[PDB]
Design a binder for this molecule. Structure first.
Ligand SMILES: Nc1ncnc2c1ncn2[C@@H]1O[C@H](COP(=O)(O)OP(=O)(O)OP(=O)(O)O)[C@@H](O)[C@H]1O
Ligand SMILES: Nc1ncnc2c1ncn2[C@@H]1O[C@H](COP(=O)(O)OP(=O)(O)O)[C@@H](O)[C@H]1O
Ligand SMILES: [Mg+2]
Ligand SMILES: [Mg+2]
Lengths: 478, 471, 55, 249, 119
C-alpha cells in the first residue's frame, strides 16, 4: 500500500514534494520520519506538496511521510492558561507537557451576520488617553499603529495587566520578535501577576515562515474556545507586517505571481480572515466575545502605506503613536487628532462620557495653538485658556510605565482638570498633585469611589467639589 | 561509501548526482580534489555547499571558490557534515577564510584540532538570560546618549566615508585595553586594502594577540561572502559555550551580507522580493541574529556596521535589521565635513538602556537636558542665519552659546586617529563625561572660546587648551 | 511709529502668503512624486512576471 | 615594479553585454534582468588593482572605472554595485556643468577614503581650511535667496565661498602642477584674494601663475623638493608683491 | 564642434553665456513661484529680463512652415546669429517688448516688428 504512506521526491527552502499519500486530505497534517510536522497544501495529480512546519535541514529525498488523518488543529483548553507555547501547541518553557484534552481547527468560519450583537460593554485598558479619547468595547477590533520604539508593546502589556480583576482572558501572540524580548515580556507579566489568566504564543525570527504565518490563527483558535464557552477573550497581534512578510516569503517560494507592490494578491484576504473572527455574540450564541488589537509598523509615520491602509479598512478604528511626541517626552504618544474608535463610545461609561467631550475640545485647541507659543499674546484667546489648559491636559495625560489606574480615579482626575481646579497649580507640580490626590482619595473618598463603581455615573457635584477643595487645602506648591 | 559526479556547471552553481539512498543532507560540504590527468586539464581543489534536492539523485549546490576548469563527471566526496572550522585557543591571533583555513602564512592548523559545524539551532527559551548591564566604551557620545548593553546588539548606520570602520577599530582598541576580553572580527565583504590595513594596525597595537579574524574578500563568490558571518559567529559562540566568557563580535557590513544572500537566491532562481532581494531575507536575518544572545554561561555583544544606500533608510537591508538592534547609532556626512568626529548624530541615536533605573537619575537628566538644548538650538539656526542673534531673547542667546560648546565637546580624539592627525587619543569614563556635561550645562565654562572644546578628552583638557590659547 | 506698524503688518501678510504658496507647491510636488514612483514599481512587477513566464 | 593607471570607460556597457549573453544562455535573471553574478564579475575585475609591498617589488596599479547614470539615478543596480566596491566616488552633475562650473565635481557628494595619505604635506596643510570654507558656504547658501541684509558673517562666508568656487574652476586640457595648486589655494584661503572681485579671479590666477615663473622660483623649488610649504614670511611677501602690480577692473 | 579652436572664442563665449543665463533662469522658477517677482535681487531681475528675450529670440520662422503660417521664413547666417545674441546679452535691446523677438530672422527684424507694434 502507498495510500497512507509516501516518499519525498523533492526538498528545498522548506517546501517538499511527496509521491503517494492517495487518501490524504487537503489541509491535513502529515508526519515525517524524524518527527517534523507538515501540511498537505497542494494535492497535485501524481504528487503532494508539503509545507514543513519546522527544521527542514534534517529531511532528505527518499524518506517516508506518515499520514495523521487530522485536519490541522491546535490544542485548546484551560490547561493552556499561564504557559508560553508555539503555534503548534508544543510548550517552549519546559515545565512539563500541557495536559489538555480538546482540539480546535485552525481554519474555521467566522460568526454569521445573524449571530452577532452590537458592542455595548466597556474594555478598561488602564490608560488615560485610551479610556478618554478612543474608548474600546468588548468585541471591537482596534488597530494600534505607529513607528519603531513608540510604545505599542508597552500599551499592550499595560492593557493586559489592567485586566487583573476583570473577568477577561488575555492571549498575547508574539510574531517575529527577539526570543529574549519575548522572555522579558513573560518575566514582566509574571512579576505583575498577569500569568494567572494569560496565554502566550511565540514565533521567533529564527522559526520557519509557515510558523510565523500560522501563529495568529492558532491564537484565534485558542480564543474561540473560551469565546464559544461564553467567556470574554482579548487577543493581541504584535506584527501583522511581519506576518505579511512571512506570507509573501511562502508565496514567492511557491512561485505564485506577485501582486501590487510585490505583496501577494490575497494579502488583504489574509488579514480579513484573521480579523473577521473577532465579534460580540448574540444571546442565542451566548454572551461570549473576542476583541483583537493588531499591530502595524509604519515607515516614518507613513499611514498611506499598503498594509496600514488594508488594516485600517478592515478594523473598526485606529490608535496612532507619533515618534516626535514620544521623543518630546510625551511617552503615551497617542495622537488624539488622528486616533479614532467608531464602534466605541457607545460602550463608554456615562461618568467618563460626561467629561471626555470637554477634554477633547481642550486638547484639540491646544493642538492647533501650540505652534504660536513663540510669543504668547492675545490674552484669553491664546494665553489664559488655550496655552494653559492644554499644557495642563498634556501634563495629566502622561502616564508611567506598567502603572494602570482605575477608571474611577481617571474620572476624578479628568473632572478636576476640566472644571478648572488645576488652573492655579503650576505645570511642574501637576503630576505630583495627581499622585497625592490618588492617595487622598484612597484615604477619604470611599463613598465617592463606591458610588461611581456601583452606578457608572458621577457622584453629587457639590460633594465632589467640596472634596476637591478639601484636598487642595492640604496641597503645598513646590 | 559512495561518491558523486558533476552533472552541470552554471558558473558558481554546480549539480552533483549521487547513488540512490546516499544523498547528502542540506548544508553539507562536498569536497572536489582532482589532479590533472594530462596537459589538457588543471588541478582543482574546491568545496561546495548543498542547497536543494532536485530529485532523481540530483543535488543543487553553490561553490565557495572559482569553478573554472571543472569537467563533467568529476568525482565528488561527501564530508557528511556542514562546513566545520577550527575553534578554541588556536584561533586567537590568526586570520582565517570562510572555510577556516588560515591565510596569514603562519602555518596550518593541526588536523586533530576540534572543529564545530557552522549551522546550528539557536538557544531555546529556557536557557536565555535577560539581565541588563551597561558596557562602558570610553566614547563620550556613546556613553552619554546611546549607552551600550552587555550581551546586546548595536548597529551603526551611515553612508560612505562617515567613519564606521574607524569607529569599530576604536571600539575594539578601547574595549580590549580596558576589559581584556576576547574579540572576534568577521569582515563580511571585506575590501582587501582595508583588511590589510586593519591587520597591520592591530598587529602594531598588540590587540591581535586576543582577536580572531575572518575576512572573505569581495572577490570571493557570494556563497563565501554569505557564510563568512556564520563562520565568525561559530568561532565566537565557543568562548561562551565552553568557557563562560563575555565575547565581542564585530561585523564589518551587514548590507554586503544581504547583497550576497540576494545574489545567491538569484543564482538559485527564486522569484525576487520587493526591490530585488531574496524572499528569505527576514529568515536569514533572524537565523544570523538570533544566535547572538546572552545565556547563563556567558554573553556575546555585537557591534554591526550598516550601510545605507543613497540615504534611503526605507531600503529592505537597513529596514529588516532594525528589529534586532538594542541601540542604534547614526553618522552624518554633514557632521563629518565640519570636522566633528565621530560625527554621531546626537538627536537620531537611540538606545533602550537610556532609562533612569538603568543608567542612573543624574545620567538620565543630564542626557535628556543635553538633547533638549540641542533640539532647541536646531530650530533657531535659520532665524540666526538671516537676522542677527540679537533678535533672539535673552535665554535663546544662552541656549545657542551653550549648544555650540556642547556640540564641540561631543567630539573626541581617537587612538586610531593618530595615523590621520598625529594627536594622541584619550579614554573618558562615563562619570567624567557626565560631570563635564553637567558643568557645561550649568554654565561654569561660558567664558572659554568655543574652539577649545574641539577634539578633546576630559573637561580638564578643555581648560588646558584654553590656557594654551591664551585665556 | 505708524509707518513701522504698517511695515510689520505688510511683512506679516507677505510671509503668510509665501507660506501658503510654498505649501501648495509642496502638495503638488508630493502628489506628482507619489504618482510617478508607483509606475516604476508596477514596471518592476511586470518585468518579474515576464521573466518568470519566459522560463 | 612599475606603476600603472587603468581606465575602464563603460562598466555599464560591459554589464549590458554580459546581461545579453546571460539572457541568450537562458540563465535565470535578477533585478533589472541582470544575472546574479554581475557583482561577482565587477568585484573580481576591480580587486586586481593593488599596491604591492616591498617584498613583492613595490609596484602598483590604480583603476578608474566609469559608470553612466540615467537621469542621475544613483540607486540603480549597477551604480550601487560599483559604488559599494570602490574606495571612493566622484560625482559629475549637468546642473553644475551648465552653470559654468566645469569640471563639475560635486564636492558635497564626492568621497575619498584614502584622502590625506594621498597628498603631500603642504597640500594637506592647505586643503583643511578649504574643506571647511566650502562646507560653510554650502550650508549657508540655502539662505542667499532671502534678501541681502543678512548677518555680516553670513555674507562674508558667501563672499569667500564664491571666490572658492571661482578658484576651483579649470579649463580643458590645462593640467596645473601641484606646486602651483598649493600656492593658489594658500592665496585663496589666507584672505589675500578677498579684495579682488569675483569676476577677476580667473585672470588673477593666470597672472599669478605667470608671475611665479619670473619671480618666486625659490618657493616652487622648495615645494618641489621638500614637499612642504615654504617660509610664511617669504610667501606672504611674494603674494603682496604680485598684488601690488596686479591691475583690477 | 563647440570648442574654442573650432568655432572661435567670440562664438564660444557667447554660447556659454547664453547657456549660463538660461540655466539660471531655469533655477529661479521655484523661488519666483513661491516668493513673487518683486522679491528677486536686481541681478536676478535683469537675468530674467534677458533670459526671456533670449529664449524668444531662439525661435525662428522656417521656409517649410509657410504652409502652417503665412510668414515666408528666413535664412540667418552664423555671423548674424552670433552678433544678434551678443547684442542681446549686452543689454542693447532691453526696452523692446518680449513678444517682438518671437519667430523672426536677423536681429533687425525684431526692431521692425517693434516699430510695427508701436514700440
Ligand atoms: N509610558 C512610558 N513611560 C516610560 N517609558 C516608556 C513608556 N512607554 C514606553 N516606554 C519605553 O519606551 C521604549 C519603547 O519600547 P516599546 O517596546 O514599548 O515600543 P514599541 O513601539 O513596541 O517598539 P519595538 O518596535 O521596539 O517593539 C521602551 O524602552 C519602553 O520601556
Ligand atoms: N576620527 C577620525 N579622525 C580623522 N579622520 C577620520 C576619522 N574617522 C574617519 N576618518 C576619515 O574617514 C575616511 C574613511 O572612513 P571609513 O572608516 O572608511 O568610514 P566608512 O567605513 O563608514 O566609509 C578615512 O580616510 C579617515 O581619514
Ligand atoms: Mg514591540
Ligand atoms: Mg567601512
Amino acid at each position: 500500500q502507498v495510500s497512507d504512506v509516501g516518499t519525498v521526491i523533492q526538498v528545498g527552502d522548506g517546501i517538499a514534494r511527496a509521491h503517494g499519500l492517495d487518501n490524504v486530505m487537503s489541509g491535513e497534517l502529515v508526519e515525517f520520519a524524524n518527527g517534523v510536522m507538515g501540511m498537505a497544501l497542494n494535492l497535485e495529480e501524481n504528487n503532494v506538496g508539503i509545507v514543513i512546519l519546522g527544521p527542514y535541514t534534517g529531511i532528505k529525498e527518499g524518506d517516508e511521510v506518515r499520514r495523521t488523518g487530522r485536519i490541522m488543529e491546535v490544542p485548546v483548553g484551560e490547561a493552556l492558561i499561564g504557559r508560553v507555547v508555539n503555534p503548534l501547541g508544543q510548550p517552549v518553557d519546559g515545565l512539563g507537557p500541557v495536559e489538555t484534552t480538546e482540539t480546535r481547527p485552525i481554519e474555521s468560519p467566522a460568526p454569521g451576520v445573524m449571530d452577532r450583537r452590537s458592542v455595548h460593554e466597556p474594555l478598561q485598558t488602564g490608560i488615560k488617553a485610551i479610556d478618554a479619547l478612543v474608548p474600546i468595547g468588548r468585541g471591537q477590533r482596534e488597530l494600534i499603529i505607529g513607528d519603531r520604539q513608540t510604545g505599542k508593546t508597552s500599551v499592550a502589556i499595560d492593557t493586559i495587566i489592567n485586566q487583573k480583576d476583570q473577568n477577561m482572558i488575555s492571549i498575547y501572540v508574539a510574531i517575529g520578535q527577539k526570543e529574549s524580548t519575548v522572555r522579558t515580556v513573560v518575566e514582566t507579566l509574571r512579576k505583575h501577576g498577569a500569568l494567572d489568566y494569560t496565554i502566550v504564543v511565540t514565533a521567533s525570527a529564527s522559526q520557519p515562515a509557515p510558523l510565523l504565518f500560522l501563529a495568529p490563527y492558532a491564537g484565534v483558535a485558542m480564543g474561540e474556545y473560551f469565546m464559544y464557552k461564553g467567556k470574554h477573550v482579548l487577543v493581541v497581534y504584535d506584527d501583522l507586517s511581519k506576518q505579511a512578510a512571512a506570507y509573501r516569503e511562502l508565496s514567492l517560494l511557491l512561485r505564485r505571481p506577485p501582486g501590487r507592490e510585490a505583496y501577494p494578491g490575497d494579502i488583504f484576504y489574509l488579514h480579513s480572515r484573521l480579523l473577521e473572527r473577532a465579534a460580540k455574540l448574540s444571546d442565542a450564541k451566548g454572551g461570549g466575545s473576542l476583541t483583537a488589537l493588531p499591530f502595524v509598523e509604519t515607515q516614518a509615520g507613513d499611514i498611506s502605506a499598503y498594509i496600514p491602509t488594508n488594516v485600517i479598512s478592515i478594523t473598526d478604528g485606529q490608535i496612532f503613536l507619533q515618534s516626535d511626541l514620544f521623543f518630546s517626552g510625551v511617552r503615551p504618544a497617542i495622537n488624539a487628532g488622528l486616533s479614532v474608535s467608531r464602534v466605541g463610545g457607545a460602550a463608554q461609561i456615562k461618568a467618563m462620557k460626561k467629561v471626555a467631550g470637554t477634554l477633547r475640545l481642550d486638547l484639540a485647541a491646544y493642538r492647533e495653538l501650540e505652534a504660536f507659543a513663540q510669543f504668547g499674546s492675545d490674552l484669553d484667546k491664546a494665553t489664559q485658556a488655550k496655552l494653559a489648559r492644554g499644557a495642563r491636559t498634556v501634563e495629566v495625560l502622561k502616564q508611567d510605565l506598567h502603572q494602570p489606574i482605575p477608571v474611577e480615579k481617571q474620572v476624578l482626575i479628568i473632572y478636576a482638570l476640566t472644571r478648572g481646579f488645576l488652573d492655579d497649580i503650576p505645570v511642574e507640580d501637576v503630576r505630583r498633585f495627581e499622585k497625592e490626590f490618588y492617595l487622598f482619595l484612597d484615604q477619604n473618598g470611599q463613598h465617592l469611589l463606591e458610588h461611581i463603581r456601583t452606578t457608572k455615573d458621577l457622584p453629587n457635584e457639590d460633594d465632589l467639589n467640596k472634596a476637591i477643595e478639601a484636598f487642595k487645602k492640604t496641597f503645598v506648591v513646590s | 561509501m559512495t561518491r558523486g559526479r558533476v552533472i552541470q556547471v552554471m558558473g558558481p552553481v554546480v549539480d552533483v548526482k549521487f547513488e540512490n539512498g546516499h544523498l547528502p543532507a542540506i548544508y553539507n560540504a562536498l569536497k572536489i580534489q582532482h589532479k590533472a590527468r594530462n596537459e589538457n586539464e588543471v588541478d582543482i581543489d574546491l568545496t561546495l555547499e548543498v542547497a536543494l534536492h532536485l530529485g532523481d539523485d540530483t543535488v543543487r549546490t553553490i561553490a565557495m571558490a572559482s569553478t573554472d576548469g571543472l569537467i563533467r563527471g568529476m568525482e565528488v566526496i561527501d564530508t557528511g557534515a556542514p562546513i566545520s572550522v577550527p575553534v578554541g585557543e588556536v584561533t586567537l591571533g590568526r586570520v582565517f577564510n570562510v572555510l577556516g583555513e588560515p591565510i596569514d602564512l603562519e602555518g596550518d592548523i593541526p588536523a586533530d584540532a576540534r572543529r564545530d559545524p557552522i549551522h546550528r539551532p539557536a538557544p531555546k527559551f529556557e536557557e536565555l538570560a535577560t539581565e541588563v548591564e551597561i558596557l562602558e566604551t570610553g566614547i563620550k557620545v556613546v556613553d552619554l546618549l546611546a549607552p551600550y548593553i552587555k550581551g546586546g546588539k548595536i548597529g551603526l548606520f551611515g553612508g560612505a566615508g562617515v567613519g564606521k570602520t574607524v569607529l569599530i577599530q576604536e571600539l575594539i582598541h578601547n574595549i580590549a585595553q580596558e576589559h581584556g576580553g576576547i574579540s572576534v572580527f568577521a569582515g563580511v565583504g571585506e575590501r582587501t586594502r582595508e583588511g590589510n590595513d586593519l591587520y597591520h594596525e592591530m598587529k602594531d597595537s598588540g590587540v591581535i594577540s586576543k582577536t580572531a579574524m575572518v575576512f572573505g574578500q569581495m572577490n570571493e563568490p557570494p556563497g563565501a561572502r554569505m557564510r563568512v558571518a556564520l563562520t565568525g559567529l561559530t568561532m565566537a559562540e565557543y568562548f561562551r559555550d565552553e568557557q563562560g566568557q563575555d565575547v565581542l563580535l564585530f561585523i564589518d557590513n551587514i548590507f554586503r551580507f544581504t547583497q550576497a544572500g540576494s545574489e545567491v537566491s538569484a543564482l538559485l532562481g527564486r522569484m525576487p522580493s520587493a526591490v530585488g532581494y531574496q524572499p528569505t531575507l527576514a529568515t536569514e536575518m533572524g537565523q544570523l541574529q538570533e544566535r547572538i544572545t546572552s545565556t547563563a554561561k556567558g554573553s556575546i555583544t555585537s557591534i554591526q556596521a550598516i550601510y545605507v544606500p543613497a540615504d534611503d533608510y526605507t531600503d529592505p537591508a537597513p529596514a529588516t535589521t532594525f528589529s534586532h538592534l538594542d541601540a542604534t547609532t547614526n553618522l552624518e556626512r554633514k557632521l563629518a565635513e565640519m570636522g566633528i568626529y565621530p560625527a554621531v548624530d546626537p538627536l537620531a541615536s537611540t538606545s533602550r538602556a537610556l532609562a533612569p533605573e538603568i543608567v542612573g537619575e543624574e545620567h538620565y537628566q543630564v542626557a535628556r537636558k543635553v538633547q533638549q538644548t540641542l533640539q532647541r538650538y536646531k530650530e533657531l539656526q535659520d532665524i540666526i542665519a538671516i537676522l542677527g542673534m540679537d533678535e533672539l531673547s535673552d535665554e535663546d542667546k544662552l541656549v545657542v552659546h551653550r549648544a555650540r560648546r556642547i556640540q564641540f565637546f561631543l567630539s573626541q580624539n581617537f587612538h586610531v586617529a593618530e595615523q590621520f592627525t598625529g594627536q594622541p587619543g584619550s579614554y573618558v569614563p562615563v562619570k567624567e563625561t557626565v560631570r563635564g556635561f553637567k558643568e557645561i550645562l550649568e554654565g561654569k565654562y561660558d567664558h572659554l572660546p568655543e574652539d577649545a572644546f574641539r577634539l578633546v578628552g576630559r573637561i580638564e583638557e578643555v581648560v588646558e587648551k584654553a590656557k594654551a590659547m591664551g585665556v | 511709529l505708524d509707518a513701522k506698524a504698517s511695515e510689520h503688518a505688510a511683512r506679516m501678510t507677505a510671509m503668510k502668503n509665501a507660506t501658503d504658496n510654498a505649501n501648495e507647491l509642496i502638495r503638488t510636488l508630493t502628489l506628482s512624486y507619489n504618482r510617478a514612483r508607483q509606475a516604476a514599481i508596477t514596471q518592476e512587477i511586470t518585468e518579474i512576471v515576464a521573466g518568470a513566464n519566459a522560463l
